[PDB]
Design a protein around this ligand. Structure first.
Ligand SMILES: CC1=C(/C=C/C(C)=C/C=C/C(C)=C/CO)C(C)(C)CCC1
Length: 174
């Protein structure tokens, strides 16, 4: 049971165009502090020069109770690893958070599911101190019993097992 971040294995030869399109977040594992809550849908596209970007809608509560529908946007720069990106994000609205997080795709089938992960804070022993993860599906209705078994194994080998929470979509942002 090695939970060092550098130990985690990511998607072999990640194909940036097979991955583009609409993805629906079905479950998540939260990080410390302020973060997207529900009704979150992401849209990936890749330009002619291979650059990948994405926009995202989601409900987020602020200060104290203030649900707003955050329109986020991120760009991705490539690393020595096809699956491991650096993502710069920001919102159409200014008060919304800007920032830079790693963006790694641990696993995907590009036809039905994608499993994302990001460690914002590394510990002294290499394991992650503060992290979040997303489980996306191409189908707004969710994964098959059989794709769910793959997903739950991924969560365990990430040491995030039993820490995910089902995301719901009730047109709060449509
Ligand atoms: C770029 C965007 C993503 C992440 C957004 C997050 C990090 C937003 C947080 C917003 C907050 C907390 C705003 C507070 O005012 C993910 C990874 C889903 C995939 C594609 C595009």
């Amino acid at each position: 049971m090695d939970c060092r971040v550098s130990s985690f294995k990511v998607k072999e030869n990640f194909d940036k165009n097979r991955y583009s399109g609409t993805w629906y977040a079905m479950a998540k594992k939260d990080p410390e502090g302020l973060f997207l809550q529900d009704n979150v849908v992401a849209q990936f596209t890749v330009d002619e020069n291979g650059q990948m970007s994405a926009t995202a809608k989601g409900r987020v509560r602020l200060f104290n109770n203030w649900d707003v529908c955050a329109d986020m946007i991120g760009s991705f720069t490539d690393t020595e690893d096809p699956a491991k990106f650096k993502m710069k994000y920001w919102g159409v609205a200014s008060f919304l958070q800007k920032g830079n997080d790693d963006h790694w795709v641990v696993d995907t089938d590009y036809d039905t599911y994608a499993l994302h992960y990001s460690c914002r804070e590394l510990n002294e022993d290499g394991t992650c101190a503060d992290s979040y993860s997303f489980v996306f599906s191409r189908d707004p209705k969710g994964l098959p019993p059989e794709a769910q078994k793959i997903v739950r194994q991924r969560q365990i080998d990430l040491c995030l097992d039993r820490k995910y929470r089902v995301i719901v979509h009730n047109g709060f942002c449509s």
